[PDB]
Description:
GO molecular function (chain B): ATP binding; endonuclease activity; exonuclease activity; identical protein binding; transferase activity
Keywords (chain B): Antiviral defense, ATP-binding, Endonuclease, Exonuclease, Hydrolase, Nuclease, Nucleotide-binding, Transferase
Number of strands of chain A: 16
Number of domains of chain A: 1
Order of helices and strands of chain A: EHEEEHHEHEEEHEEEEEEEE
Domain HD (chain B): 1-97
Domain GGDEF (chain B): 451-598
InterPro entries (chain B): Cas10-Cmr2_palm2 (IPR054767), Cas10/Csm1 (IPR013408), Cas10/Csm1_subtype-III-A (IPR052117), Csm1_B (IPR041062), GGDEF_dom (IPR000160), HD_domain (IPR006674), Rev_trsase/Diguanyl_cyclase (IPR043128)
Distance between the termini of chain A: 28 Å
Oligomer: 2 chains of a larger assembly
Amino acid sequence: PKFIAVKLIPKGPFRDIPRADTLFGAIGNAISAIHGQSAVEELVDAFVGGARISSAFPYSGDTYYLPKPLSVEPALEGDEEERYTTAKRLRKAKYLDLKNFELALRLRPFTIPEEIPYARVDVPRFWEEIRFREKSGVYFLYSGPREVFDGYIAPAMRFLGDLFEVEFHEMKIDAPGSEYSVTLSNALPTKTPVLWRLLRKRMTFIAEGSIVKNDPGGMERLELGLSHEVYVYGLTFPLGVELPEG
Amino acid sequence: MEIDELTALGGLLHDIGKPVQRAGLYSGDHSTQGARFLRDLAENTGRAEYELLSLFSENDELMIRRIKELSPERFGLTMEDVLNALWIVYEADNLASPQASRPLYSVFNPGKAYPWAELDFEKELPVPGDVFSIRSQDYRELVKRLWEELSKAKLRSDRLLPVLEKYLTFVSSVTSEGNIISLYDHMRMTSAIALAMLRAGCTAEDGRCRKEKRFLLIEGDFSGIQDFIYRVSTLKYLRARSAYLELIGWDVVLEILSRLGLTRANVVFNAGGHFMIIAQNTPDAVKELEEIRAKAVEWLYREFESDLYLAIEWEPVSGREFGREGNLFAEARKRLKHKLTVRKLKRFGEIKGLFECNRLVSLGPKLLGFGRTAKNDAGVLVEGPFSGFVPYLQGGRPVGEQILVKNTLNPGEIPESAQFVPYFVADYFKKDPKGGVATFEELSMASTGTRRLGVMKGDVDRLGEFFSSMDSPSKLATASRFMDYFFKGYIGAIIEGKFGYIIGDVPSLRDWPEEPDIVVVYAGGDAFFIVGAWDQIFELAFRVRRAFNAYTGGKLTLSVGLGYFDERTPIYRMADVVSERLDTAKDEGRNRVFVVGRSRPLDGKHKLSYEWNHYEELWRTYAPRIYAGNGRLKGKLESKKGLLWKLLEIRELYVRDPNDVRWAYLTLSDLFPELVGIDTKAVERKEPQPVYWVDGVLKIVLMAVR
């Protein structure tokens, strides 16, 4: 399927690569400041309706990176010294280039990005930031109706711009038709998933790249006591993935 | 006695004939000669049970009559039972699977062999050297000590293993050329396999157990260990976290053995958070494993909220697969490994409801071990998934169905009913003026020159392959133990300053002290994390790597990451940085140390890491010309400390551009003749200039002089 990739061009360093729950959060708060809670409700409805945003991922110029699907971790076996060494390095890699991502989905051979377009500095005194390489930033995907992108996602992203500046392009990801799918977003699962890495925030999220079988994820609204019922985004951004038997 | 205890002791003593043959004595073959040793022993002291256990070393005509003469009723055993116990133990000897003087050839290097000695961590480093005949005296001394211990031993497998481990550890199980298997290891892996076959219920089978999946390989591996230990909220506390992980692991293993009615012989290995057990494949077992696996994870989840997970898996395996046909065993281990990797991508899947610190301060000197009791018990200082752990002090009494006793193979004064579980741990620590362990502050203050804490992480290179190349359980057992024991056993000794002849002449800044400013955080399996005064930690890395070179046949290699931090750096960052530096030494090829952080050209030709031999040679070359020792520069360079600093700023104008020839233009001039000239072989070999390497020496010297 084809999607809208929101590209964040940074005006200096970033604290973290924002993931879907904190992206929706940021967009939610931005909409409440522009169009009141009425619009936030129309946004949650649109998203519950079938609309999805991915977590943020690195881009370097004209290269779109995507999370390594956990589908491959078991199948890596499918020279001893080369085999052990390669397997560990592929295991360690957290991202694959789009070209190679589309391969890993079909359990065909693929290669890793050599240098990743960011490096976590940690200035002491301590805490750390993220230094972005030249013409390298972060992006996230939106699948849904355009009138929801134009009405909410787009204006919110500009508002949040004012540390970064925003442009968006059309993007295509060839993904095999399958019973199984990868999430491109951290998700609060409904059903027990196939393969996953947990993520602690308190909430228990499945990480990006984790594999689910027909699981849309869910949203959660809770009364913190902050006067407006806050929504936590936990919907799955599914792309079909071929699996090895076992 | 009972059929289960008999079969265990039966496999465990089958081949005790070997050492008595080698020492002379009964003049028979090892089979007949082993019978005469236990029968003679039985008669001495007057414990008939040994005469029953003597039948194992030997058309079933005589056998039935010889058994019949020995009253089976006296030990509450059936005659028909004992025939099973013998046949079972017979096959068990074949599955775990010639002059007299031939010693044990190293698992690390079959070319070299071990000089006879009993296992003693205090009494010297096992160094596989030249092949020497072991005298028919050394074995006579062995058998008499062995006979004396077996006399006073309580005849349970937990009290028999430690004396077999003491004496038969450095003994060739078979006296052929390039035989790698310790006898102790073959004996415990025959006790292990035998008991399995009994629990599997298979009997009178001369191949129903052999060519049928009547065994289970149980591999248990903890994950996220790094986060559990080094990423929470002091050294006292961080030591206890590492110790808590040891007890937790034991609590699971012992529970598994308890509920499957197996003995500690069935623990193929238990090192660095990784354990393997051989067991029966009864539906009763897999049920008891599914029950255990679940109740452990649930507890580990409740207690640490996903920081620490235990991935347990098991595979149905047959007698065929414990040996080679045309290496099945390794391939049965691979199919089990893959099962585990899959389970580690399903962390806490055993909890359906997943998708809906004073006791460690008082646990962080004076104790001998721990008592594995029920949770609801007085004095329980820490608790694991299945059992509370009651600290066992010098003057106190041990409490619990199992007692875990630290850094000995001798039960000592513990009750006759209590199961003896020995455990070794590397826990060396520099004592304060107060009886308590030194602090990051006290350690950093001790260092020569600069006041920095020293941190070294150290792993063994391509262990997965080394273990994968093991034919048989007994081989894997001899491999694991010798590996684990280097770190658990001898790192303590290495820190004390022992084995000077084996590891002499390694880079050093000061004279090696009597009470070194070092604290081991962990030292087990194939890895170690140690902190201390930065200059003492720097030297220790080279000492440890040299000892390990000797302890192996120079056939295995370490990689080390070193770190020199401000004492006020958090534990979690120091760990993350030395971790980053370690897997960097591995990535840049293996068998190399990350000595100190370094600027370099990012042209993919320049390695931050040094090969151990490269650096060791660089230090031998330059250090003696510039450094006098114990924090003092050479008298010639007092009033010239800058000539060093100028080479660092010179190397920087090589880092800026390693093609720019300005560093030639810039270059007493006698001092450092290697660097001044433009190297050429390096330009052809596509390698760095000597200039690139020197900083590794100088920066360390300048830290020691400030």
